[PDB]
């Protein structure tokens, strides 16, 4: 991650 | 420090 | 008084920008940790050996721009949290534009782009940082003119950085 | 009196329009003919089962217009010009449009498009006019509005027709 | 083909 | 065409 | 005696080679000039300039198999049919291959494949003979040996050429 | 006693299955652990929306096999790991397979494939273990025949779960 | 991320 709790968006 | 850019 | 020209953080995450190669590479990503989700670009293929990713913004009409001001927010990873962190991963990333006076839609040449910068961060995030919800964000910013043509694009390479972009914003002074 | 915002003959294919499935469906072609450099959008799945193939332009600037024309140029051969020409083949092809405040990019949701109308030719050109270099071009003209958001986008959707689009054109009244 | 001597562009 | 009256195949 | 291991025209054009880049090269074309269709993979970026489309096949099992023999059966255009006699177009196509103990799916890497040989062909088929419904069909066999490892992989190279592939067949003797 | 036809954990990682959509859906991740690489796929679109990600398999040589027999380990993420994983997050993916004579390489046609069950995890991953080096891995056995045909594929259908297929392994007894 | 500490593979 290069961002923490990041989930891929539409 | 700051940068131009031609 | 600044006239924003384009600004990333303002969309919620709408934009839809291009990216090289059609696949892999850099991805739109969110972070829900609050009511208001925050919106990203963010890239991590740390162990694969030389990368070549490139994200590529929409159509920005210059307008009455004589130059413009470039500012972004981003974050990086030590490499040295990742298994044989350095030769596997960079801790930077470059800075393209490409000026056009009409809209080029998917049509992307790689040959086309000017490098204005490499980008470093003053700040990288270690693992101890990351694995708690605490990211060092930093913020860098340049200038480029003049541009002559009706518009420009702007161009992010990747080389196997752990990058996450969270902000860009382009301008003029009044 | 008519104050064009979008004309794709003039830009020598330089527009590279957005094409959807990714890799099928539309395609941009090129016509040399007596050192005429002539450049197209177009399909001929005709065969192959059914199709739902779109074709979106760039994000185009609304600016003060509120009633814009679109004016569309196009060929469209004869079902019966192909074996399996029942159900396979249609002859014609659809204008959707989207009204959007800011360039969504590359973001294209097909379920966003409002239906303009079905673009039927007068003149679907046969093989032997196919043959002989005298294809027929069809001129079809819309109109659409109160468009009340910065920009719009056009959709061209082909459902199983042998298609090309040599011009399309937008403008307003003033 | 959709146009005659038509081949795909760039 | 590559080959007289050829459609893309599935 | 002859042991076939791969036959594409003997299957109905279902193989579904593998194609470099993704939506830009070969394609997989019919035709129903009886009955029964006849299926290929046809390429002919003529006048778009240089290209480097590659179609791999499957994963063909060596067997006990020694030496191979590739039968090639294809037609090629005259590059004087298109505007400019050359520079954009080219009347041959590279044959590659490359062995493998596993099947490696869709991994492809252009690193690995072996250069066989140039195919040209005996005869290229002119416009009038094209325009007509008759074509000159070429069939160009090559061999090679020793193999060693579990199976192989054959690639096929254009380089700006207009080039039909209608049947490809390695077989080895006993 | 046990003849295996398949072993994705002992291929190092290499073996370029097919995913679809193209480019999105699953992906092939890699995890250094105490320099051990572990190989697996992975997706975990969970917020995305509607989600329909297939992973298929190459093809298998049956051989003298009859009833096969399918092992897989995996992990799934607690669902309420992630805030607005309501709707959009599932907790289980399905498993598919077909039969064929021939290799049909990259020819995926989803409508052909036969579904074997639904694959409910004994265990899954809270934050609190993810966090931790602690992910709990669930093994799954099925069983499928009589198989007929000189090959079969098998195809893995994620829903919208955060599923890392560690491995996979088809046999049969003898 | 699905399996932690994760990155993709050629």
Not at chain 2, 1 to 6: D, M
Not at chain 3, 43 to 66: F, H, I, K
Not at chain 3, 102 to 116: C, M, P, S
Not at chain 3, 162 to 167: K, P, R, Y
């Given at each position: 991650?290069?961002?923490?709790?990041?989930?891929?968006?539409? | 420090?700051?940068?131009?850019?031609? | 008084?600044?006239?924003?020209?384009?600004?990333?953080?303002?969309?919620?995450?709408?934009?839809?920008?291009?990216?090289?190669?059609?696949?892999?590479?850099?991805?739109?990503?969110?972070?829900?940790?609050?009511?208001?989700?925050?919106?990203?670009?963010?890239?991590?293929?740390?162990?694969?050996?030389?990368?070549?990713?490139?994200?590529?913004?929409?159509?920005?009409?210059?307008?009455?721009?004589?130059?413009?001001?470039?500012?972004?927010?981003?974050?990086?990873?030590?490499?040295?949290?990742?298994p044989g962190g350095?030769?596997?991963?960079?801790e930077t990333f470059?800075?393209?534009?490409?000026?056009?006076?009409?809209?080029?839609?998917?049509?992307?040449?790689?040959?086309?782009?000017?490098?204005?910068?490499?980008?470093?961060?003053?700040?990288?995030?270690?693992?101890?940082?990351?694995?708690?919800?605490?990211?060092?964000?930093?913020?860098?910013?340049?200038?480029?003119?003049?541009?002559?043509?009706?518009?420009?694009?702007?161009?992010?390479?990747?080389?196997?950085?752990?990058?996450?972009?969270?902000?860009?914003?382009?301008?003029?002074?009044?």
């Amino acid at each position: 991650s290069a961002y923490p709790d990041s989930v891929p968006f539409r | 420090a700051h940068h131009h850019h031609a | 008084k600044e006239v924003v020209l384009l600004d990333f953080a303002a969309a919620g995450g709408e934009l839809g920008w291009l990216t090289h190669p059609y696949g892999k590479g850099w991805d739109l990503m969110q972070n829900i940790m609050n009511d208001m989700p925050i919106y990203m670009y963010s890239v991590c293929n740390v162990m694969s050996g030389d990368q070549d990713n490139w994200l590529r913004t929409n159509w920005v009409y210059r307008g009455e721009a004589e130059r413009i001001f470039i500012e972004l927010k981003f974050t990086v990873r030590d490499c040295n949290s990742f298994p044989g962190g350095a030769s596997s991963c960079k801790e930077t990333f470059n800075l393209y534009y490409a000026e056009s006076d009409l809209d080029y839609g998917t049509n992307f040449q790689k040959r086309l782009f000017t490098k204005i910068d490499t980008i470093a961060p003053d700040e990288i995030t270690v693992s101890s940082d990351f694995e708690a919800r605490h990211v060092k964000l930093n913020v860098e910013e340049r200038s480029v003119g003049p541009l002559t043509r009706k518009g420009f694009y702007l161009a992010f390479q990747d080389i196997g950085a752990c990058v996450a972009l969270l902000s860009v914003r382009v301008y003029y002074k009044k």
